């Protein structure tokens, strides 16, 4: 018996994976081309994607790159209340 | 060729203004002559840019 | 001349609201007569100005 359910979003950012290598980007150069890779979601390069930051410019040359696979990362907390009788 | 140099320029740019205060904001007239009925019209404002 | 040049306007006189606290000499935050201002007003009157 679920009584109350609330869903909350902690973070919302975009992470880019290479189709071939399967790694995540961690760093880029002056031209925004990749300098490094990392196989860790927590350390990967991130573009903020909360509502105020949509339609960015900093990573246009990155997004257009076909080898890269953008991924929308979302972190959530949900609260579930229960009643179990006597 | 100009990796380590100081470059100086003279340039032309288009003119632009923004409104800082409104002076003599609203001016009015009840125009009635040669009209079916009375009409209200807003006369020019003056702007301080 | 005044009626010719003027603009139609509503005019209401002002008077201190009874809600003023007798000790602090300052008014209640919200009462029907005045909505926080220390001064009340009378019924409107029509005038050209």
């Amino acid at each position: 018996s679920i009584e109350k359910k609330e869903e909350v979003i902690a973070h919302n950012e975009v992470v880019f994976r290479s189709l071939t290598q399967g790694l995540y980007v961690k760093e880029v150069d002056i031209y925004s081309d990749v300098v490094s890779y990392t196989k860790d979601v927590d350390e990967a390069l991130a573009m903020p994607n909360t509502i105020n930051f949509k339609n960015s410019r900093k990573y246009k040359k990155l997004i257009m790159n076909l080898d890269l696979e953008p991924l929308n990362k979302i972190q959530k907390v949900i609260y579930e209340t229960h009643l179990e009788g006597l | 060729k100009y990796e380590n140099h100081t470059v100086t320029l003279k340039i032309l740019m288009t003119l632009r203004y923004v409104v800082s205060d409104i002076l003599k904001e609203s001016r009015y007239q009840y125009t009635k002559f040669n009209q079916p009925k009375s009409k209200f019209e807003n006369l020019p404002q003056k702007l301080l840019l | 001349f005044i009626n010719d040049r003027g603009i139609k306007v509503l005019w209401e006189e002002a008077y201190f609201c009874p809600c003023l606290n007798p000790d602090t000499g300052h008014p209640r935050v919200d009462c029907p007569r005045c909505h926080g201002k220390g001064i009340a007003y009378l019924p409107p009157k029509e005038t050209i100005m």
Partner: protein
Amino acid sequence: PIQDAKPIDDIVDIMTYLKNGKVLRVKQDNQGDILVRMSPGKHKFTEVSRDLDKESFYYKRHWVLYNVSVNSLITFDVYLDEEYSETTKVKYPKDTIVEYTREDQEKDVAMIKEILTDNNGNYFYALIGETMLFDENKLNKVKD
């Protein structure tokens, strides 16, 4: 052949598509491409957006009012946005002025109107006022 472009000829169709609510894409000369739209809800009015890229989780189109003129619509090229292909990778686009030698080895100027290709990417061009095809090498771009 390639069907990257499907221009609309009749404005009546454009209005009909607008009544259907589908987004349009209108070209501009030496200026940014624009998208056009009809507003939903009770009040119907034209809206515009300078955002071209596709709607996404990281990208949302921004719409605002505007008093668009039919003169731009009737004259400029118009397309359905979703059906549009960003580019056709050829040396000389359509409506591009080139200099070519006619069949009798006399040189004339022309503008290009054709899209044909083999399966390898070799392209051919047919010139306005002409019938046969012309290669990428044969044509020469006419400088402004």
